[PDB]
Design a protein around this ligand. Structure first.
Ligand SMILES: [Zn+2]
Lengths: 98, 175, 96, 1111, 195
């Protein structure tokens, strides 16, 4: 589970709601993708920084932090964790069906 | 009312406020009326006359009204590959400038070591190389037990001797 | 090598600005702001651009400083009938 | 010759054809003329079928009109579709990316019957794109061709099948109408007859007949012999018209309660109402001809009819009973037999006019819907036709066809042959037809009905083999879209001069003779039994007094490109196919010498391709320059032909045009004035005549490779001009406007020397890879300024450089001169796409010389790349000292059965050397039938060998015998066509004579410069980090599953790991491996590919708990 | 045939509750990118449309149930939501597929796994690859068996890091930036070191 090419086994099974919520780093509830004017992802949308990671490297939703020093500290105004934007290629969320 | 509000709020991939959807639909409707009436398409200035707003905002509305296309629709004349197979990765590491960056880092280290230790440290903490923060004159003063004016003079002297032809020529090619 | 835009005439070497033959003395901050505006005529400059270039990077204060300086420059050189240093809300400032 | 300026071309043809080749663009021009309704087409319809002359637009208008409301007290109608003068000339439209179009107007009549009101208005229907005089459309500055497609004609088709359970012979029929619901009948394994309608697999014919207002008594009275379905009727288990109607309703429309009237109205509405079901006029004609319903009546009521359905059922049952002839009540006697689906009497050709008419039909259907809605909504007595009509759907539909439809393609113009072959081409793909995923081998086969309709040789070679062909040179399109071909008639065993055009329908009812039959100059054939084609496509011998038709000429069965292959009959079918397919890929050279040996087709091909200027009115020539030619006509007026020079074609080849006339000579109407790209003196010339030897040489021509002398490089015998265009646009953006300016940050000065003050490279300034063509600088502002940039601007004094440089740079791997520049801007009124304020296109030319890796080919499918360019001294040279120009291997001929190329070689040497047959004591035996004026030919003569009435082997041998010497008394080439060569390397004479001659060799558009690629590190895709693909991006080769299998087969594991991980997906591995290789340390261990992680997250998003276990 | 699944459920630790779904996951945004191509036009990954449809149906359903509505309305909404989820995973497995502009089906999740053009085969087993080239083939009759003649330009492009490092070793360039420039302009001091 560490991505070191040392894999003793690879297992597949049916996924439960608990496992889905464990994978999810948040809940997406708004069918909004990108702002039509500022071209920035909306909050709680399908691209939300708070749920999936910051769009730009080492930057918050408003740019309150713009330095590599802030490691793993979430913005109190936005809620985004300051890390590499490549986490958006790994971070996944979920929706709750009525 | 419910149907139109829902259309404005949900029909587009990129959400457009109803206040802007209304103007987009009105512009399109009256522009097609004008085309039908006049026999040719109306120009942006003519349409701005009816919008009672300026042609710059007319053009901004026009370019706002555009919608996205699918990254997976077949682009080829036959069905062979998707449009997503033609789009670059802008954010990807180019993998040749990284080596240039690290080697320029080493060269900057060497050039800074050419200078005196005091001036080298002043410039390092002044431009944020050891850490991420380029500190202020007060901070370098409190860490070096020296007045901020003397810091300004030491920075100017350091910059003057750093302008020296060999350092300038050595760093110039790295651009 | 003389920086120009219609009415405003800025010369770096002699360090003062003219309004079609009308010089006025400006503060250093506002002078750098005006200079690095005029060299970018017709182009939008955002607040981080402004703060990082005219001010130093380590400016840890709040942004309205540039707001006040643009007000200064407007009441100083825009004081003519026409408005040149226009503002794009949430984006920045352009002289045009 | 029948062409005023034709160069003399002596021919070996024995027989004289009765009729000359038709206008080769008729297939497109006549169709578009029919669609528009020009007076020329008016006269054509008047002289042929004047009973109902109606154009396509008039027909669709008359069909749509009148549009009615629910009340019926007011209505709308259309009439008089008229055009207007075109917007701009073709050259202008191509120059400024316009569309060669014309306004269209319709005289709308709005009528009101409650009180009486007539409103007449000339409503503007839109701007219809027009067709140029050369048969192409101009759309946004591009030349597009709409290829005619092949579709099964709508109608009724019978087929027979074997059940294979009991070997019972089953028969089925399908009524397939265009824009309708299917009708089906069949006989089952048992005696039951099925009428599965609209894919509902029930209902024997009893219920349908009963619902059609018929009773069991009427059924048994009319249909008595049919014991099979008489038993089926006895097992109806449903009596009563109402019962049958409710059964049909509850089957076809589940979930809704049947009513007494809904059943009847639905059964009528499904087929008998033209609003929902109509065979086209072609479909109605096909059904009428098949069932013998109406033979002296005009075509109307295109919808199906009840008596037509009952006639279909009667035909099916009579066929299953083994009958051979039926007479429908009130109808003519007709044969009873099954129908072939691929017979060209059933496979119709949708042409440009038909496709355009169908798209207009869709647009006007949307028109009618919208106008009916608005005419209901708006208040009455205040409504106008202008307020009713809203042309946006119509214009959108015509645009949506003319762009982005696979039946509308770029008119490839490597040469006039390629253009003329893209036109007059028959495709079988696109909407309404089968696709490559659907093609059957029976479809791809050559049907015997193809003879004289569609060529069986000329066709693409790849996966779409057989789905694309070309019209035969003599073919024509019937008014109903069926391909018909001319043929002469024989009466009393004597061939008349009367020519009738015959469709594949009537050809089976005739016995057509052969083109090259031994005619007696009176009408009779010398032998009683002649070889002919009978009804079923069979070929047999027949007494001469029984045939009734004969071919107009040889080459009737062949296309236009293939007809330009000399000695075609001596070439194998597939090699001739390859030759015909490569005829249209030859690039235009700088000279285009006419071939020494050819056919008579080149003159007409060059004339009809439209790439050669022709004198439209006879007159003298007043003055001539390199760009314009002015002619002084007889009747006072003078005309000026402007001549296009160095214009880039759609495929990046020059389209230079050159005058071939003097300053005082007179010209007649139709004569060539100025030759085009691939033409000489007005006849097509796609290559050069090269002196060839056919011996293998040192292994450099091993396996289809080709060797050439260096004088072909030196004299520019094989060289081409390749013009390339590059585009860049300055467009507005959120931060301002990009500007094209020579001021570009952090650039040197020598690279700015070729840039003028405008910011664009000077015309004539030569350019190479990596240079700037357009200095276009974009507003970016500033980004994260790394500490090192600040340090640099501090140390040296670098300025703000606030802007970014997205300048136009020449793409990697080419160079050359700059021809010209076009600049578009909004400040000059020029119409531009919204958001773009400046557009720049830059044209770059390369004079590409011949080099190794380039592909050469003959006209006989003998292609090959250039193995080696050899110095002129080191080449085999005849005793005269002339070196050979090109060497081809001798192992490639006998294996592929293209001896015709050797025949061409011999005849080319004879035509190059000249000849004189000594008629001292009469002519020799072989020359008895050889035509006069051919017994004696000067050196460097030109000869034409028509494809099947060609030069016989005996004639060629006799010509080779007398081959008058070149300069002194020397016959280098002996009686059998061979010659003695001297080896240019060792000097000793070659031990045995080898054949030498002159062969026509052409350079194909497969130059190595356009096919060389290499990649070390470039772009990567987004979703997965794989490299890109193709020369447009930076590429990266595909290591496929087969290559993976080969790597595992070698047992080589580490290189497989590296080919999959640190070259394609492992991002950290890529960066680290580049750093390691530059620094000089060994390659690091590969990591985990990114594509596998993408797959893991993808499977996780499908509700699959997939994970990795470490112990 | 029924036991071969019932016993499979019984033997292991999985629970047949997994057939039905109370929550669905969402693919990471970079796996379904939305990017602005040249000319200002925008491009989406065609999966966001399915996700948006599902979100819209779910939000409308929850609004309906929290506001109070007839059971037939609520059931129609529930059927729409179920069809949306089925379209998300498999577009076209049930009924006609959901189609976008141009009357073309939207590609669903499983649509990027199945098929020769799918991920497993077109992207995972096979792979586009760096340090590679192609060109036409000519005969080299004077070569040896273990030998192949390579174009000098394409060889230079292929061996680019190797040759740049070696040429900065030979001091023909001072740094790799200068080396890259002389590689791009193909200066004569690169051909001899290429061999
Ligand atoms: Zn923040």
């Amino acid at each position: 589970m560490l991505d070191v090419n040392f894999f003793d086994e690879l297992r597949i099974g049916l996924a439960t709601a608990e496992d889905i919520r464990q994978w999810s780093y948040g809940e997406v509830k708004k069918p909004e993708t990108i702002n039509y004017r500022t071209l920035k992802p909306e909050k709680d949308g399908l691209f939300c920084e708070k749920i999936f990671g910051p769009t730009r490297d080492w930057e918050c939703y408003c740019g309150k932090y713009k330095r590599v020093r802030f490691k793993g500290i979430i913005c109190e105004r936005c809620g985004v964790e300051v890390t590499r934007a490549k986490v958006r290629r790994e971070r996944m969320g979920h929706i709750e069906l009525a | 009312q419910a149907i139109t509000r829902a259309m404005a709020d949900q029909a587009r991939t990129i959400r457009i406020p109803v206040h802007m959807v209304e103007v987009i639909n009105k512009l399109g409707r009256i522009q097609r009326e004008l085309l039908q009436d006049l026999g040719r398409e109306p120009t942006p200035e003519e349409l701005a006359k009816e919008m009672d707003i300026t042609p710059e905002k007319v053009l901004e509305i026009q370019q706002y009204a555009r919608e996205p296309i699918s990254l997976d629709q077949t682009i080829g004349d036959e069905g062979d590959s998707q449009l997503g197979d033609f789009i670059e990765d802008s954010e990807a590491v180019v993998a040749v400038d990284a080596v240039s960056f690290t080697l320029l880092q080493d060269q900057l280290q060497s050039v800074l070591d050419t200078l005196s230790e005091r001036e080298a440290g002043v410039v390092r903490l002044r431009f944020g190389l050891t850490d991420g923060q380029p500190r202020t004159l007060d901070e370098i003063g409190q860490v070096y037990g020296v007045t901020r004016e003397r810091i300004r003079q030491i920075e100017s002297k350091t910059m003057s001797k750093l302008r020296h032809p060999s350092r300038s020529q050595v760093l110039r090619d790295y651009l | 090598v003389r920086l120009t835009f219609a009415d405003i005439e800025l010369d770096e070497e002699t360090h003062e600005v003219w309004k079609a033959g009308q010089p006025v003395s400006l503060s250093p901050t506002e002078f750098t702001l005006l200079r690095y505006f005029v060299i970018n005529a017709g182009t939008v400059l955002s607040k981080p651009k402004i703060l990082d270039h005219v001010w130093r990077y380590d400016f840890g204060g709040d942004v309205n400083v540039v707001e006040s300086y643009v007000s200064y420059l407007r009441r100083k050189i825009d004081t003519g009938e026409k408005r040149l240093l226009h503002t794009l809300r949430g984006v920045g400032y352009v002289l045009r | 010759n029948s062409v005023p300026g034709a160069p003399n071309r002596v021919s070996f043809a024995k027989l004289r054809e009765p009729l000359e080749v038709p206008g080769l663009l008729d297939v497109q021009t006549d169709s578009f003329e029919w669609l528009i309704g020009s007076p020329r087409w008016r006269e054509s319809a008047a002289e042929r079928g004047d009973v109902n002359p109606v154009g396509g637009l008039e027909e669709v208008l008359y069909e749509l009109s009148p549009i009615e409301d629910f009340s019926g007290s007011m209505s709308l109608s259309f009439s008089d579709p008229r055009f207007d003068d075109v917007k701009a000339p073709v050259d202008e439209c191509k120059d400024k990316d316009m569309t060669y179009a014309a306004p269209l107007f319709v005289t709308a009549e709005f009528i009101n019957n409650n009180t009486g009101e007539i409103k007449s208005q000339t409503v503007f229907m839109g701007d219809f794109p027009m067709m140029t005089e050369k048969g192409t459309f101009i759309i946004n500055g591009t030349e597009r061709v709409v290829v005619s497609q092949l579709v099964r004609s709508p109608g009724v088709y019978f087929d027979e099948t074997i059940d294979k359970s009991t070997d019972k012979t089953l028969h089925s029929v399908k009524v397939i109408p265009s824009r309708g619901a299917w009708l089906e009948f069949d006989v089952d394994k048992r005696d039951t007859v099925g009428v599965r309608i609209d894919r509902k697999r029930r209902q024997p014919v009893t219920v349908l007949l009963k619902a059609l207002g018929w009773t069991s008594e009427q059924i048994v009275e009319r249909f008595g012999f049919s014991e099979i379905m008489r038993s089926t009727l006895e097992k109806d288990n449903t009596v009563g018209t109402d019962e049958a109607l409710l059964d049909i309703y509850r089957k076809l429309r589940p979930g809704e309660p049947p009513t007494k009237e809904s059943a009847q109205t639905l059964l009528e509405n499904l087929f008998f109402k033209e609003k929902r079901y109509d065979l086209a006029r072609v479909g109605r004609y096909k059904v009428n001809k098949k069932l013998g319903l109406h033979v002296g009546e005009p075509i109307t009521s295109s919808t199906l009819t009840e008596e037509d359905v009952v006639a279909t059922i009667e035909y099916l049952v009579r066929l299953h009973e083994g009958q051979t002839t039926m007479t429908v009540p009130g109808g003519v006697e007709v044969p009873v037999e099954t129908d072939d689906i691929d017979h060209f009497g059933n496979r119709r050709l949708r042409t440009v006019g038909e496709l355009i008419q169908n798209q207009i039909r869709v647009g006007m259907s949307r028109m009618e819907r919208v106008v009916r809605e608005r005419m209901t909504t708006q208040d009455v007595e205040a409504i106008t036709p202008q307020t009713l009509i809203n042309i946006r759907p119509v214009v959108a539909a015509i645009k949506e066809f003319f762009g982005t439809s696979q039946l509308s393609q770029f008119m490839d113009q490597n040469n006039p042959l390629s253009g003329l072959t893209h036109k007059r081409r028959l495709s079988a793909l696109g909407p309404g037809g089968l696709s490559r995923e659907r093609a059957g081998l029976e479809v791809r086969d050559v049907h015997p009905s193809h003879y004289g309709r569609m060529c069986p040789i000329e066709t693409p070679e790849g996966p779409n083999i057989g789905l694309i062909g070309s019209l035969s040179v003599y073919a024509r399109v019937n008014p109903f879209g069926f391909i018909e071909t001319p043929y002469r008639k024989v009466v009393d065993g004597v061939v008349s001069d009367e020519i009738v055009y015959l469709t594949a329908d009537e050809e089976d009812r005739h016995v057509v003779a052969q083109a090259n039959s031994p005619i007696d100059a009176d009408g009779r054939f010398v032998e009683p039994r002649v070889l002919v084609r009978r009804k079923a496509g069979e070929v047999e011998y027949v007494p001469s007094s029984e045939v009734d038709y004969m071919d107009v000429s040889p080459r009737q069965m062949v296309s236009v490109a293939t007809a330009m292959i000399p000695f075609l009959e001596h070439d194998d079918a597939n090699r001739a196919l390859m030759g015909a397919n490569m005829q249209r890929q030859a690039v235009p050279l700088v000279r285009s010498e006419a071939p020494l040996v050819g056919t008579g087709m080149e003159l007409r091909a060059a004339i009809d391709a439209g790439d050669v200027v022709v004198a439209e009115e006879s007159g003298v020539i007043e003055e001539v320059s390199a760009d314009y030619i002015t002619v002084m006509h007889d009747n006072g007026t003078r005309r000026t032909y402007r001549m296009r020079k160095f214009a880039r074609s759609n495929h990046g080849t020059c389209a230079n045009q050159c005058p071939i006339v003097d300053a005082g000579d007179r010209v007649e109407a139709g004569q060539v004035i100025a030759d085009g790209p691939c033409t000489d003196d007005g006849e097509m010339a796609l290559g050069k005549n090269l002196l060839v030897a056919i011996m293998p040489w040192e292994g450099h021509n091993y396996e289809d490779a080709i060797i050439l002398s260096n004088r072909l490089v030196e004299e520019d015998v094989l060289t081409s001009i390749h013009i390339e265009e590059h585009e860049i646009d300055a467009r507005d953006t959120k931060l301002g406007a990009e500007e094209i300016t020579r001021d570009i940050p952090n650039i040197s000065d020598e690279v700015l020397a070729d840039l003028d003050e405008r910011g664009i490279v000077r015309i004539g300034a030569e350019v190479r890879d990596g240079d700037i063509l357009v200095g276009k600088v974009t507003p970016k502002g500033e980004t994260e300024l790394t500490p090192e940039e600040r340090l640099l601007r501090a140390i040296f004094g670098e300025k703000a450089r606030e802007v970014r440089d997205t300048s136009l740079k020449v793409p990697h791997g080419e160079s050359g001169k700059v021809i010209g520049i076009r600049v578009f801007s909004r400040e000059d009124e020029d119409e531009l796409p919204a958001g773009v304020n400046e557009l720049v296109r830059v044209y770059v030319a390369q004079k590409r010389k011949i080099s190794d890796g380039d592909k050469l080919a003959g006209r006989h499918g003998n292609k090959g790349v250039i193995g080696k360019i050899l110095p002129v001294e080191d080449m085999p040279f005849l005793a005269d000292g002339t070196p050979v120009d090109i060497i081809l291997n001798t192992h490639g001929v006998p294996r592929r059965m293209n001896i015709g190329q050797i025949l061409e070689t011999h005849l080319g040497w004879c035509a190059h050397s000249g000849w004189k047959v000594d008629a001292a004591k009469g002519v020799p035996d072989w020359a008895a039938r050889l035509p006069d004026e051919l017994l004696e030919a000067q050196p460097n003569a030109i000869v034409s060998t028509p494809v099947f009435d060609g030069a016989q082997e005996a004639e060629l041998q006799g010509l080779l015998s007398c081959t008058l010497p070149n300069r002194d008394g020397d016959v280098l080439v002996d009686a059998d066509g061979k010659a003695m060569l001297f080896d240019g390397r060792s000097g000793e004479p070659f031990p045995y004579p080898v054949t030498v001659g002159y062969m026509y060799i052409m350079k194909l558009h497969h130059l190595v410069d356009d096919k060389i690629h290499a990649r070390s590190t470039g772009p990567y895709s987004m979703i997965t980090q794989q490299p890109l693909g193709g020369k447009a991006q930076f590429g990266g080769q595909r290591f496929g599953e087969m290559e993976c299998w080969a790597m595992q087969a070698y047992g080589a594991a580490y290189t497989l790991q590296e080919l999959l991980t640190i070259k394609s997906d492992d991002t950290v591995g890529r960066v680290k491996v580049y750093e390691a290789i530059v620094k000089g340390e060994n390659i690091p261990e590969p990591g985990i590919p990114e594509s596998f992680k993408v797959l893991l997250k993808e499977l996780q998003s499908l509700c699959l708990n997939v994970e990795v276990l470490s112990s | 045939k029924r036991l071969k699944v019932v016993a499979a459920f019984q033997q292991s630790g999985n629970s047949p509750m997994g057939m039905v779904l109370d929550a669905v996951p969402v693919i990471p945004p970079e796996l379904r990118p939305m990017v602005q191509l040249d000319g200002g036009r925008f491009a989406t990954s065609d999966l966001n449309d399915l996700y948006r449809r599902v979100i819209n149906r779910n939000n409308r359903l929850k609004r309906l149930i929290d506001l109070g509505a007839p059971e037939i309305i609520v059931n129609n909404e529930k059927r729409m939501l179920q069809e949306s989820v089925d379209a998300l995973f498999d577009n076209g497995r049930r009924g006609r597929p959901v189609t976008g502009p141009g009357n073309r089906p939207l590609k669903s999740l499983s649509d990027l796994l199945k098929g020769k053009q799918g991920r497993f085969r077109q992207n995972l087993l096979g792979k586009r690859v760096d340090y590679s080239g192609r060109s036409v083939i000519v005969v080299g009759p004077q070569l040896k068996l273990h030998q192949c003649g390579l174009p000098k330009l394409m060889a230079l492009e292929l061996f680019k890091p190797f040759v740049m490092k070696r040429l900065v070793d030979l001091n023909h360039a001072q740094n790799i930036k200068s080396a890259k420039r002389m590689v791009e302009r193909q200066r004569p001091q690169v051909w001899d070191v290429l061999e």
